[PDB]
Amino acid sequence: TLNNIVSSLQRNGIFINSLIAALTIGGQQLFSSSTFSCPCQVGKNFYYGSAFLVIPALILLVAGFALRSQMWTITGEYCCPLECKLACLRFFSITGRAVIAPLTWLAVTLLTGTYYECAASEFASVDHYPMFDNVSASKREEILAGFPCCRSAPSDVILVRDEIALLHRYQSQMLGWILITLATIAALVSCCVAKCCSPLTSLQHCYWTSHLQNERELFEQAAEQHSRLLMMHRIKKLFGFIPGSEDVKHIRIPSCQDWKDISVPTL
Amino acid sequence: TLNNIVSSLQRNGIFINSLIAALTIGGQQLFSSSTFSCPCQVGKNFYYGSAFLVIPALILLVAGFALRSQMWTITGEYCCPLECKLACLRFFSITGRAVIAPLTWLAVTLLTGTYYECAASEFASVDHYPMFDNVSASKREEILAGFPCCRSAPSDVILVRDEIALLHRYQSQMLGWILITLATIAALVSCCVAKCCSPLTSLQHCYWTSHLQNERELFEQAAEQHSRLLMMHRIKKLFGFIPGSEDVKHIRIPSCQDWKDISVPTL
Amino acid sequence: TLNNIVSSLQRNGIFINSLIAALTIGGQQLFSSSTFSCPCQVGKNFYYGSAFLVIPALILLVAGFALRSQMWTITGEYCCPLECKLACLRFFSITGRAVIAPLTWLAVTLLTGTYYECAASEFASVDHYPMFDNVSASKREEILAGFPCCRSAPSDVILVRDEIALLHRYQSQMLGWILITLATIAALVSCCVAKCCSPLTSLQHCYWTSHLQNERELFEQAAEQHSRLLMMHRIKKLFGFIPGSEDVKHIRIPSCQDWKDISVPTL
Amino acid sequence: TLNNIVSSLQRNGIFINSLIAALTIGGQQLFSSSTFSCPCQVGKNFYYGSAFLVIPALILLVAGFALRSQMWTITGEYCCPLECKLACLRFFSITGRAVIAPLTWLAVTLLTGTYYECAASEFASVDHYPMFDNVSASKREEILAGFPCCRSAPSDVILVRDEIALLHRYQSQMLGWILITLATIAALVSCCVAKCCSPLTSLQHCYWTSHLQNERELFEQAAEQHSRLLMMHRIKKLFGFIPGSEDVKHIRIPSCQDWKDISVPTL
Amino acid sequence: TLNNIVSSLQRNGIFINSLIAALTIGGQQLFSSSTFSCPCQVGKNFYYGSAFLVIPALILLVAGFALRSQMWTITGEYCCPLECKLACLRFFSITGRAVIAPLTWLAVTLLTGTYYECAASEFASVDHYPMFDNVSASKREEILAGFPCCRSAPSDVILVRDEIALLHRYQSQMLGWILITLATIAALVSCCVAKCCSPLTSLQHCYWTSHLQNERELFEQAAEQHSRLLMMHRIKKLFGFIPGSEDVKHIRIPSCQDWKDISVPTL
Amino acid sequence: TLNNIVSSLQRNGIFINSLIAALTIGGQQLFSSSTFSCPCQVGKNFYYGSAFLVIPALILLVAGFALRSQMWTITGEYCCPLECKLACLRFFSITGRAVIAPLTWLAVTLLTGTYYECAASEFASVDHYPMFDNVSASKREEILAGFPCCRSAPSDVILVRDEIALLHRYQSQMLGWILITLATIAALVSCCVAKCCSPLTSLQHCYWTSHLQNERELFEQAAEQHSRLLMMHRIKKLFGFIPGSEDVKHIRIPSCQDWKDISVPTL
Amino acid sequence: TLNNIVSSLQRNGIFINSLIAALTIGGQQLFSSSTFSCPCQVGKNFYYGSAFLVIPALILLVAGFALRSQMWTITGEYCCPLECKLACLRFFSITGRAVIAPLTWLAVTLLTGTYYECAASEFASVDHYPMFDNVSASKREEILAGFPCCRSAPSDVILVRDEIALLHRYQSQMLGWILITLATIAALVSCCVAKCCSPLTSLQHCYWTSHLQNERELFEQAAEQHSRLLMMHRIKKLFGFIPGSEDVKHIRIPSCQDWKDISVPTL
């Protein structure tokens, strides 16, 4: 009964996607909490924030594609009629499974806002501030590059610092919501177009998916068993008894040519 | 006996709806407690409050529609007599299941009132207040935009601040109740009209719903088994034995054309 | 033996009603403790108290009616001799089950008294108080509207405040008892009239109720099984084997017209 | 063996009565501890104490009568020889079960004495007290109405207050004992008269009570089963198979008139 | 059922790789936390940081290759047509398993950044610093070599120290991301080329891998059993009974030449 | 099933080696923590550090060789063609098992560095230090010999002390890494040469190892049983019954010569 | 299965030796911690340290020899060809088991060093110390005899005391290592010579040891059973029934001579 509910969960797309999203959230939380500190330099703040913001998204997307064995088969079909559309639909389902990780990472990282502040702490528009008039441009880049990591300046500076930080957090969370909404809308219209383009009815589709899963599992079982039987026959020929046999009555001593023979697997 | 009560709960619309509502409430509580802070800017306070207030409602509604497989089938029927009314009724039941999430999120978020204060902290009507007479309009937008996040001004300011906050909380909770009542009334009249328009009697309807559930489960079971049998026959033809067979007496070595053959699934 | 006592409790009207009442009490306690604060405005105090006092009662009553499936059947009978009286009696039992929630909520909320103080904190009769003579009417509405939420005024004000609060709590609890007594008396006379009007004897009534419960459960079981058998025959016709069969000897490959055929359920 | 001792307790009148009394005591304790505060007004103190003292007694008595199904049957007999006396005896046993709740509530509430002090804190006889000579009658009602809730006056006032409180507690507990004794004596003489008037011997009575319990349970079992059999026959006629049957060989498709037919239950 | 899921995990490449990565991370954390301290010398800081950075990577890579028994067989094939490509593919899978450890160690050690600071604390570009103008070159190497381990100098020195440390941490984490991205991209293009060059189809490949695993396990089982049977026959010849036999009736005392005989195993 | 996984672990070389390494690490940690203190003499510091560093390595190596029973058999073969190479390979496997302990002890003791500081605290190169110019050579050996155990001198001395200690820890850990790398490289090239020199194929080798293990276990079982049977026959001859027999009917009293006879075991 | 692994451990020489060593270590630790205090006399310090150092070693060695029953048999053989060498080998194995205790006790006691300091605290070479020049020889023995137990003298004395204590601890631990190395080397060369001198091959030896163990256990079982049978026959003769018999039909009353007879056991 345990394996019953195990497979029943395995089929559930919702459970697998929720697990992927929860794992991404937790991993991102730990990762940010431990290994994130702003450089607080002048030219290198941007790249530092954008790397954490973007790179793991690409990594996780490429992982979500490459870790699906079915993707390799469909690529082999493409790599050097109806079948084209069916391949497109399988690749579509693969994309649906894979895309959940980069977008959840991006959404949680933007909603938290910590990365964005560091990423765009130099682009702050400072035109109506009383302390920044006299300061030289280079000195301006220096004072502007210090705000996110820490505060050591007088109270007026920490005031303007907190105001800029609040503005940038707002911008970050707004980007997060724009991305969430755009992604859900795109996924909806994409499922709509996929259903519209499908040459199958609503019943043939279920038979199709079941056929795919059963076909893969059955061919792997059969191939493994047939190979084992052939190997067991090669060994019975060489030694003179079947490996599983009990109380074998005839044993054949191998010669010096038989070893040479069984060296090669005949593919 | 466990799966007995599991399916018995699965049928219960009341239990599923209560679970959806409890999960939405808890998720909203955590979400608000962790990632909510007002920008306390001048033009950007509104959008920030309205995003949290509205966007997750749209997200959850689109989710409640799209996650129901039956909706995809009915759309396929619509996508390029009595059947039209039956499709309308199924889509109606789907809507009934889906609508519970956005309205519970909206009701709990309005009753709590925290989002509304930030959302409409600029529109405060300040005409009979003694400190706001002399202040310039821009300075007025600046002092008005600071009240929700924190208080650093003298005691008179914190007094007027607390009064405005109480007024806005009142308005929020009133909107919450208006929405709850309007939604329940609309749901009631909608179920009434649906029952009135139904061409079925009170008994044919039960037979209908049972037929729908049984039809879907049975066709998926049958299709999966038939596909497995056909695949098991293709493998018996290629290898020479049935994958489940024990003590197979005849094994056929595949040729170089058979692999080419079994490459294609014949759809 | 577990399901034995489970159904035995399910039949018990007393247990179900006690559970409904306990759940309403607990929910009201939590709800009031968390999301209740007085606006302490001038015109908006009343509506705020009356909403919490009244709206959930209407909500819970409409819920207690609409969540009973039998009510839908009786409405369908009414919706576009002896049977009329029997329908009246069933609807009466439904009302008996449903009414327990709004009245328990109202009784507990009035006995607690917290809502009533806020609801009617403006209507206080202030004619024999020494501080309210000179105060202007608008200023009077302002001082009167502040008493429930908090006290910041001198000791004389907190004295008169506590006195008004005690008077209003008294009025609230008295209303609570009047409502409890009126409701119990009405329920008693209503059960009396229902028994008096019943055209059945004391024995035919038991047979009647048992007939109703058995009729509903049996027709749902039978209809579900018959639909499953018909579906299993349609699938045997299409595929060539019965879904439950083991070691099927004849498999029929479907054609391109059979899929079209089984697309429609024949209702 | 569990249901054995469960029914054995169910028969025990002593256990059921002890449970009712313990539940009433605990409920009264919680109720008084949470929702009881004196108004400390002038004209409204009395009604406030008398409501808590009396109303729940009436409520619980009407509940103890109305919750007994047998009472409904006997009323139906009365509602529009030996049988009259037997009905009187059944109604007598019902009264014996019902009366335990109001009298236990009254006894515990009077023995505690908290309600009585508030109920009769205005009627105090103040004729030999040195501070009450000069005070005007209205001022006297004001000072007299403040004693129970709290003490803020000088030490002489708190002295006379504590003395009045002790006197009223004494009166309350004395009333409690008078009520307990009167109730037990009345119950004793009432059981005596009931035994004296009973036209049955000491053995016919046991057979009678057993007959009543067995008659009710048996008729409900039989009626339910007979109704189920008749319903199962109506369904066999409509569908063509009995709902419990396994491997049904003949299935009859219903026509459009059969649904109309089975719509009505034939009562 | 335990060994079922044990082997099912054993097959999972993802689980084994995740376990290797987690173990490497934990071991690196402990190792760095306990046995890492900078020498804070002048010429020897570099080698000290580069050893920890690089050497364990080489060690773990050579371990990941050498601990795979299959690698020894393929090397024996190489050591003094289609088979060459198949050997290349097996060696490729071995590389895929092995490479996960050195790159995870390098990535975690660079992302942490502690090693890099010590490794390149001498190469700091000091051209625009006010305290380093006058200092002699040798004294410069001395002050520059002290920053990572500890701070004892005045506040200006600890300021410039913290700035250099932040710059070097930035450079380290950037190198970490460059390495992660380059490694994932190389692995992707490498799997692509391997799939492109594979002379097998998508089905022959599964049969191939299953054949390899079954062939190895079966030949080891068979060889062990055959050797045991031959040994049991040599012992039956020498002693006169089979080691497992019960109630042996004939025992042969060995002579002084038989011991000489059984001394040699005949290979 | 327990003994199943017990033997399966017993075969695992990796598990046994990991256990040996963990035990060596823990034992070394305890040993160093409890019984290690520097003498802080002048001529005797070196020997004291080198003993702990080196002696347990020799001890553990000789133990790893001598505790393997197979080593005794191969030595007996050597002690006063193909067989020589096979003996070399067995001795090689023994060495592979044995070498893991001394090198792990050496690596952990060097990486920790505590022993090395004491071992080479006299050889410190003191040529560019301001306090050591004037001090006489003997006094120099005295001040130099005190640094590791404790510090009682002024702050300048503890400064130079900490610097020397850091330098020596660096040298120790560098030696540790050099030893680890040299050992792994030597083990790799040694396994390579052993595989290259092996006159067996990749399959004959598995049969060989299995033959060795089975041969040893079987001959010990057979020899023990045969000896027991012969002894049981000597006792049956002397006493007149077989030791395991039940309900022996004939008992023979031994004479005074039989005891003399059974005194000798006939070897 | 429990006795299976119990005997399997019993055979393991390594487990028994490890247990002996652990028990000796723990016992020595407790013994030293509780009952060890230096006399701090002049002539009696030496004997006190040497007793604890040496005597328990002799005790434990004599115990390890005398507690082995096989040693008694071999001594009986010696006490008033090939057999001499076989006896030598058995006595050798006994020595191997016995020697582990005295050497572990000596090694742990020397490595700890506490005993040695007390044992040789008088022999300290005091020739280059400034306080010991003037002191008279007897006074020198008095000051020298006080250092180990406690310190009450000025700081210069505690300095020279700690230095002497460190020197003596060094000497102790060096002796410990010399003893460990000498013992392991002697054991190795001794096992080598024993294997070299053994007239048996590598297989006859296993048969020999198994024969010895089986011979001892079997003769004890047989002798016990035969004696029990003879005793049971003497009792059957005297009483007239066999002690284990059930429902004995014939009972013989003993006479006054039979008691005299059964008094003697006939040896």
Numbering used by the authors:
A (entry chain D), B (entry chain C), C (entry chain B), D (entry chain A), E (entry chain E), F (entry chain F), ...: 4 to 83, 94 to 280
Give the authors' words.
The smaller particles are composed of decameric and the larger of undecameric assemblies, both of which we refer to as CALHM4 channels. Due to the slightly higher quality of the Ca2+-free sample, we continued to use this data for our further analysis unless specifically indicated. The cryo-EM density of the decamers extends to a resolution of 4.1 Å and undecamers to 3.7 Å, which in both cases permitted the unambiguous interpretation by an atomic model. In each structure, the subunits are arranged around a central axis of symmetry that defines the ion-conduction path. Both assemblies contain pairs of CALHM4 channels of the same size related by two-fold symmetry that interact via their cytoplasmic parts. In the plane of the membrane, the dimensions of decameric and undecameric CALHM4 channels amount to 110 Å and 120 Å respectively. The diameter at both entrances of the pore measures about 52 Å and 60 Å for decameric and undecameric assemblies respectively, thus defining the properties of an unusually large channel, which could be permeable to molecular substrates. Even at the constriction located at the intracellular membrane leaflet where the respective N-terminal helices NH project towards the pore axis, the decameric channels are about 20 Å and undecameric channels 30 Å wide. In our data, we find strong evidence for a layered distribution of density inside the pore within the presumed membrane region in non-symmetrized maps and after application of symmetry. This density is observed with similar properties in decameric and undecameric proteins in both datasets of CALHM4 obtained in either absence or presence of Ca2+.
